[PDB]
Amino acid sequence: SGAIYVGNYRVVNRHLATHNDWANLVWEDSSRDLLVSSTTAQGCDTIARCDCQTGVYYCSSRRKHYPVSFSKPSLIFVEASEYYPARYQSHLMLAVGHSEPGDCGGILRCQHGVVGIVSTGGNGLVGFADVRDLLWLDE
Ligand SMILES: CSc1ccc2ncccc2c1NC(=O)N1CCC[C@H](C(N)=O)C1
Numbered sequence: 133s134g135a136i137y138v139g140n141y142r143v144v145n146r147h148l149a150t151h152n153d154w155a156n157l158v159w160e161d162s163s164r165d166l167l168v169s170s171t172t173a174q175g176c177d178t179i180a181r182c183d184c185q186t187g188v189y190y191c192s193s194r195r196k197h198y199p200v201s202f203s204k205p206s207l208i209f210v211e212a213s214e215y216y217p218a219r220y221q222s223h224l225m226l227a228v229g230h231s232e233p234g235d236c237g238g239i240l241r242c243q244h245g246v247v248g249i250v251s252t253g254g255n256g257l258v259g260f261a262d263v264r265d266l267l268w269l270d271e
């Protein structure tokens with residue numbers, strides 16, 4: 133679990149969005165596993181606007197932060213789960229690191245700010261949904 137709070141927006145994994153997230157929907161994209169909802173309070177976070185490929189992510193299954201080198205956002209095949217059929221997820225970045233399903237929502241950050249959130253994983257792999265292209269989050 134986990135979310136990004138910037139301005140009057142809350143960014144979450146679309147597969148973990150609540151009834152309240154859907155009732156205050158701003159934008160969602162099943163192909164990116166992202167959902168953004170509106171908030172009444174002003175949010176705590178800043179979004180990176182960069183091309184960093186190194187950063188640090190929070191891993192809830194270890195209560196620890198880990199450094200990672202990650203690929204550029206791309207279209208990656210993702211196996212079928214209880215939430216989605218087998219499909220290509222877009223704007224996804226992969227890295228070597230520990231992750232478990234409950235780790236989705238953990239923030240990936242670089243020196244410039246929030247880069248994205250955990251969205252997929254595998255045997256010694258972890259995937260992050262990029263948010264750096266969503267320029268409207270800052271306005
Ligand atoms: C951090 S999530 C994770 C981690 C390790 C895992 N190992 C083995 C198998 C699955 C793992 C898994 N789950 C995962 O990738 N998906 C299920 C939830 C929705 C995700 C999506 N964005 O389509 C795909």
Ligand SMILES: [Zn+2]
Pocket residue numbers: 180181182183184242243244245
């Ligand atoms: Zn950066």
